[PDB]
């Protein structure tokens, strides 16, 4: 996010972070409930990867974060690599998230749901802040 | 990348005004946002785009792609949850 500000600690309870066995954050995901995560297909998540929830400051060791394991990765099959169209994979968690004041679910809309141009929304994450 | 979580508000555009930018790369299962002075960037991917719908924050898109330079002028391109909730809806039943 180039040009964002720091979030309030635990104010986006559905945000998870995908890190490799190295502990390198490379993608973000979203909790749809305490067993499944939603992130992008292009992320290329494997099951040797771990989901992390309850995190805020990726660099603090005194934070009660939850390191969840990947059971199976579900790549939408309509996903188009050449286009990056239908870029949605689902993550099936081997070990159930424990919801709390900082770990919760995001709401999915109806295929029917409408969200019109010029509507203000919000996007969070730990992407580069400068290019 | 930054150590703690960032956030940024940003306006959703129509796909059309988007085609303006990405032209024929924008597909029906993609929805744009940004070009407001904020920009999604490397490491953002897979992450959330929420909008407030009747009290709750709803998964309106997935940080997917856009500018190589993370230009606060090009709008970013997100997954369009609305055209994919049906598959989600379905993978869960299944498993």
């Amino acid at each position: 996010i180039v040009n964002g500000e720091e979030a309030v600690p635990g104010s986006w309870p559905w945000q998870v972070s995908l890190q490799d066995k190295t502990g390198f954050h490379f993608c973000g995901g979203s909790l749809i409930n305490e067993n499944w995560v939603v992130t992008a297909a292009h992320c290329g998540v494997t099951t040797s990867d771990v989901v992390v929830a309850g995190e805020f400051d990726q660099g603090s060791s005194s934070e009660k974060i939850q390191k969840l394991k990947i059971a199976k990765v579900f790549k939408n099959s309509k996903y188009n690599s050449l286009t990056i169209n239908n870029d949605i994979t689902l993550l099936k968690l081997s070990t159930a998230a424990s919801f709390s004041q900082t770990v919760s679910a995001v709401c999915l809309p109806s295929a029917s749901d409408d969200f019109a141009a010029g509507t203000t929304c919000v996007t969070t994450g730990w992407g580069l802040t400068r290019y | 990348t930054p150590d703690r979580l960032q956030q940024a508000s940003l306006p959703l555009l129509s796909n059309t005004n988007c085609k303006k930018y990405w032209g024929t790369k924008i597909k029906d299962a993609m929805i744009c946002a940004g070009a407001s002075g904020v920009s999604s960037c490397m490491g953002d991917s897979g992450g959330p785009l929420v909008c407030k719908k009747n009290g709750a924050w709803t998964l309106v898109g997935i940080v997917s792609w856009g500018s190589s330079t993370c230009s606060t002028s090009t709008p970013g391109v997100y997954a369009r949850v609305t055209a994919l909730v049906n598959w989600v809806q379905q993978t869960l039943a299944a498993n």
């Binding site: 309030v8 104010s11 309870p13 409930n33 709401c107 | 924050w57």
Partner: peptide, 10 residues
């Protein structure tokens, strides 16, 4: 869902 315990600040 979608309604946090810690309300986000804008």
């Amino acid at each position: 869902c979608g309604v946090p315990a810690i309300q986000p600040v804008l």
